[PDB]
Amino acid sequence: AKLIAESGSTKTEWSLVEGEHLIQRVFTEGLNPFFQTRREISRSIRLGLPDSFFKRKLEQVFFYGAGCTSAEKKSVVEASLVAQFKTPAYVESDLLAAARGLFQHDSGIACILGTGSNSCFYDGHVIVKNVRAGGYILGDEGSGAALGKQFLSDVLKKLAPQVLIDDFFEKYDLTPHDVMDVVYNRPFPNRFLAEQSCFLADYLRLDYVKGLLLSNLRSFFLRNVMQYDYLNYPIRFVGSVAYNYADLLHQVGKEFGVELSVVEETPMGGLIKYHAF
Amino acid sequence: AKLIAESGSTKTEWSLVEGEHLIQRVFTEGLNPFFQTRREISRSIRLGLPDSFFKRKLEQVFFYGAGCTSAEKKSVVEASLVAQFKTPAYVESDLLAAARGLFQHDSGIACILGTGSNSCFYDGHVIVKNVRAGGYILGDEGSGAALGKQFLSDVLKKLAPQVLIDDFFEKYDLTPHDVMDVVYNRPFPNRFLAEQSCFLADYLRLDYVKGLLLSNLRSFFLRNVMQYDYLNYPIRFVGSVAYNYADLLHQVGKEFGVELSVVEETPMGGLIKYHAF
Ligand SMILES: CC(=O)N[C@@H]1[C@@H](O[C@H](C)C(=O)O)[C@H](O)[C@@H](CO)O[C@H]1O
Numbered sequence: 001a002k003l004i005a006e007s008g009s010t011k012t013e014w015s016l017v018e019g020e021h022l023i024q025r026v027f028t029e030g031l032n033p034f035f036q037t038r039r040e041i042s043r044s045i046r047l048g049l050p051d052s053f054f055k056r057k058l059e060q061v062f063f064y065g066a067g068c069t070s071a072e073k074k075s076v077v078e079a080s081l082v083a084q085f086k087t088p089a090y091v092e093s094d095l096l097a098a099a100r101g102l103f104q105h106d107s108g109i110a111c112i113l114g115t116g117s118n119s120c121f122y123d124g125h126v127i128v129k130n131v132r133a134g135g136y137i138l139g140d141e142g143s144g145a146a147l148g149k150q151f152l153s154d155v156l157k158k159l160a161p162q163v164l165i166d167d168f169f170e171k172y173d174l175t176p177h178d179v180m181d182v183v184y185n186r187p188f189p190n191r192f193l194a195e196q197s198c199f200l201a202d203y204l205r206l207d208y209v210k211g212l213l214l215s216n217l218r219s220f221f222l223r224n225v226m227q228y229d230y231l232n233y234p235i236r237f238v239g240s241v242a243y244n245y246a247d248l249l250h251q252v253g254k255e256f257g258v259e260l261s262v263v264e265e266t267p268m269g270g271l272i273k274y275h276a277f
Numbered sequence: 278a279k280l281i282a283e284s285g286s287t288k289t290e291w292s293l294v295e296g297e298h299l300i301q302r303v304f305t306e307g308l309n310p311f312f313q314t315r316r317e318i319s320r321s322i323r324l325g326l327p328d329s330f331f332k333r334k335l336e337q338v339f340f341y342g343a344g345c346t347s348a349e350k351k352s353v354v355e356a357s358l359v360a361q362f363k364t365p366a367y368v369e370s371d372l373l374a375a376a377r378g379l380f381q382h383d384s385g386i387a388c389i390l391g392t393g394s395n396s397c398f399y400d401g402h403v404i405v406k407n408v409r410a411g412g413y414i415l416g417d418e419g420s421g422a423a424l425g426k427q428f429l430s431d432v433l434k435k436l437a438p439q440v441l442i443d444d445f446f447e448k449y450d451l452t453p454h455d456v457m458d459v460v461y462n463r464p465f466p467n468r469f470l471a472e473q474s475c476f477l478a479d480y481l482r483l484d485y486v487k488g489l490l491l492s493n494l495r496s497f498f499l500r501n502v503m504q505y506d507y508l509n510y511p512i513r514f515v516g517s518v519a520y521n522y523a524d525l526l527h528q529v530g531k532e533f534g535v536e537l538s539v540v541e542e543t544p545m546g547g548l549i550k551y552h553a554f
């Protein structure tokens with residue numbers, strides 16, 4: 001048996017598979033070594049997963065997570081996985097999951113639009129070019145975190161519509177002071193900012209929300225997608241933001257003169273197909 | 278004798294005064310209750326200040342600091358001051374220091390452009406309207422933290438001039454991965470981002486830098502200043518970024534049709550004048 005895990009910072013998708021047949025699917029909280037220590041990751045995995053995962057004999061454990069950028073960061077997750085599963089674990093970027101999941105052994109451009117945002121050029125085996133994500137502060141354009149950051153900024157400065165302001169404070173039972181506390185004082189701020197993508201998904205009628213989405217989606221293209229040879233290679237998307245705003249993403253694509261066809265919610269479906277050889 | 282202190286997240290200016298005569302002035306590190314606990318601030322004051330401040334008997338303590346949003350946050354700083362000085366302390370926002378320091382008892386609009394950015398309408402007694410700063414993440418347009426946040430974003434995205442990228446990494450001896458840790462893992466990220474404002478001041482000849490300054494300075498006016506009756510009231514700036522980029526700030530001022538003639542480095546000179554009667 002093999003285990004494939006895909007994390008994006010908000011949720012971690014676990015797939016216990018046999019060849020190509022899925023045995024069990026479980027979701028835990030997101031795993032990111034920029035926001036979690038080795039102890040916190042180990043706790044998350046053990047609390048999140050049933051005992052059935054830690055009982056079944058595993059040959060390899062394939063992990064793809066956000067934050068797994070450097071060797072030091074990949075060591076944190078790996079040592080945590082090895083501790084729990086007693087199995088050689090291969091920790092890679094969630095961007096490689098997006099690449100393998102969307103293309104298998106084909107060439108093109110794989111992108112992520114979820115909690116964070118990332119992009120790469122895939123030749124069919126390895127990532128040739130990769131514009132750095134930068135995290136929720138120094139990047140992640142067109143991501144849920146970027147949407148929420150822009151939204152909450154407008155909420156605090158009363159530049160968003162009143163209906164949105166009132167509905168936000170009612171739904172989350174917060175005050176401006178509390179919003180300040182969650183972002184700066186409470187952990188996983190990137191989750192809370194990204195969580196606002198789900199909130200604003202119901203207000204697609206408002207001009208503000210359309211303007212918020214488009215401007216962020218365009219910002220992703222201009223800074224990430226534009227850097228690649230995008231006019232000659234297929235561009236495929238993965239992520240919650242991509243999936244929920246598939247119409248607006250396709251619109252932005254057409255603005256930059258590209259035809260976005262494949263928009264998957266999770267790259268996991270293709271990862272099982274990929275890890276079947 | 279009484280003590281006037283002014284903090285802006287990066288540094289704290291201390292003025293020991295009798296009436297309007299300065300006895301001693303010392304700088305320490307910045308005090309922000311969003312980034313520091315009560316025990317951290319107490320240690321910063323105790324070790325930071327000379328033995329001259331503690332042996333001298335004080336009448337009142339006037340403290341204005343960033344992060345002193347609610348009464349809850351002010352109490353943190355207040356408890357620290359009383360524990361050190363053993364004299365009633367008055368903890369307010371640094372925005373009120375800007376208002377009292379620039380206008381005294383006159384009506385107008387006081388603005389801060391330092392590590393963070395803040396704005397208000399001062400009627401000569403109290404702050405009437407206050408557009409929330411939002412902090413370095415959810416606001417602070419045209420601030421030092423905004424400049425650095427945008428610059429380092431471009432650095433990682435390989436969208437900034439190569440001359441700036443190379444000089445940045447050479448100055449700090451950092452790699453892309455290292456910069457990621459300084460912002461996300463290592464404390465006082467807002468300080469490091471704002472410090473990049475000092476860096477970009479050398480390269481004011483580059484079109485990129487001029488374009489980056491003007492972009493942020495306008496964003497401050499658009500989102501903060503223009504919420505007030507700005508065409509019928511004097512606007513006066515204070516802060517390190519305001520002082521350093523006084524030429525470009527005055528440029529933005531004339532573009533919006535206001536005469537920015539008062540730009541100060543610190544509002545301390547006015548606070549010494551204020552606290553006399
Ligand atoms: C440090 C951090 O959080 N970055 C992550 C990315 O992680 C990879 C490993 C990277 O750093 O390149 C991730 O691909 C995207 C999409 O989820 O979101 C970003 O926020």
Ligand SMILES: CC(=O)N[C@@H]1[C@@H](O[C@H](C)C(=O)O)[C@H](O)[C@@H](CO)O[C@H]1O
Pocket residue numbers: 285286309311342343344345346370371372389391392393394395409410411412413417
């Ligand atoms: C939470 C925080 O850091 N905010 C501060 C402001 O603090 C006041 C108290 C406020 O938030 O109203 C400060 O005036 C400006 C300018 O220095 O910078 C912001 O970043």
